[PDB]
Amino acid sequence: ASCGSGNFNKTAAKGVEFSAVAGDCIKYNKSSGTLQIGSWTGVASSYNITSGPQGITNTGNGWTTVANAANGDLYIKIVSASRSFNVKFDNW
Numbered sequence: 225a226s227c228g229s230g231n232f233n234k235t236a237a238k239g240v241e242f243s244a245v246a247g248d249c250i251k252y253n254k255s256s257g258t259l260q261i262g263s264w265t266g267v268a269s270s271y272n273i274t275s276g277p278q279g280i281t282n283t284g285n286g287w288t289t290v291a292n293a294a295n296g297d298l299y300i301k302i303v304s305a306s307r308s309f310n311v312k313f314d315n316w
């Protein structure tokens with residue numbers, strides 16, 4: 225389903241890893257700078273930001289920089305991932 229401020233199921237804290245699964249809809253407040261999505265589980269994942277960048281990918285071995293994500297509350301849908309994985313959202 226859709227992902228947004230009405231049905232997010234997890235909230236990410238800046239720099240704090242959490243277990244993520246395909247289908248999750250994650251709230252993340254970016255106060256400034258550029259969004260970063262990082263994972264080291266080796267599980268490939270992809271994301272859509274509501275009203276924002278689409279088709280973001282991460283190999284599971286480092287950080288994906290997402291230019292042009294708004295400051296403020298973001299809603300990030302995990303579109304694809306083969307299994308649960310540990311991920312963190314950050315900004316700098």
Ligand SMILES: OC[C@H]1O[C@@H](O[C@H]2[C@H](O)[C@@H](O)[C@H](O[C@H]3[C@H](O)[C@@H](O)[C@H](O[C@H]4[C@H](O)[C@@H](O)[C@H](O[C@H]5[C@H](O)[C@@H](O)[C@H](O)O[C@@H]5CO)O[C@@H]4CO)O[C@@H]3CO)O[C@@H]2CO)[C@H](O)[C@@H](O)[C@@H]1O
Nearest residue numbers: 239241257260262263264265285286287310312314315316
């Ligand atoms: O502050 C003003 C100034 O900020 C600059 O922005 C900086 C920012 O402040 C830094 O935090 C950021 O640094 C990040 C590093 O680039 C990145 O390499 C590092 O990534 C770590 C990750 O945090 C860590 O979790 C991960 O650990 C994994 C191990 O590698 C694996 O062995 C193990 O299995 O799994 C663990 C995780 O469970 O390691 C990676 C490295 O491999 O994260 C840093 C943030 O925490 O850099 C920014 C600059 O590049 C900004 O640039 C300036 O403009 C601004 O003025």
Ligand SMILES: [Gd]
Nearest residue numbers: 229230231232
């Ligand atoms: Gd709520």
Ligand SMILES: [Gd]
Nearest residue numbers: 240241242310
């Ligand atoms: Gd850890």
Ligand SMILES: [Gd]
Nearest residue numbers: 242243309310
């Ligand atoms: Gd775990």
Ligand SMILES: [Gd]
Nearest residue numbers: 256257258316
């Ligand atoms: Gd920058």
Ligand SMILES: [Gd]
Nearest residue numbers: 274275276294
């Ligand atoms: Gd937008």
Ligand SMILES: [Gd]
Nearest residue numbers: 286287288289
């Ligand atoms: Gd990098």
Ligand SMILES: [Gd]
Nearest residue numbers: 229296297298
């Ligand atoms: Gd908002």
Ligand SMILES: [Gd]
Nearest residue numbers: 253296297298
């Ligand atoms: Gd808010």
Ligand SMILES: [Gd]
Nearest residue numbers: 252253296297
């Ligand atoms: Gd808030």
Ligand SMILES: [Gd]
Nearest residue numbers: 246305306307
């Ligand atoms: Gd699967």
Ligand SMILES: [Gd]
Nearest residue numbers: 241264265310
């Ligand atoms: Gd770990």
Ligand SMILES: [Gd]
Nearest residue numbers: 256257315316
């Ligand atoms: Gd910072």
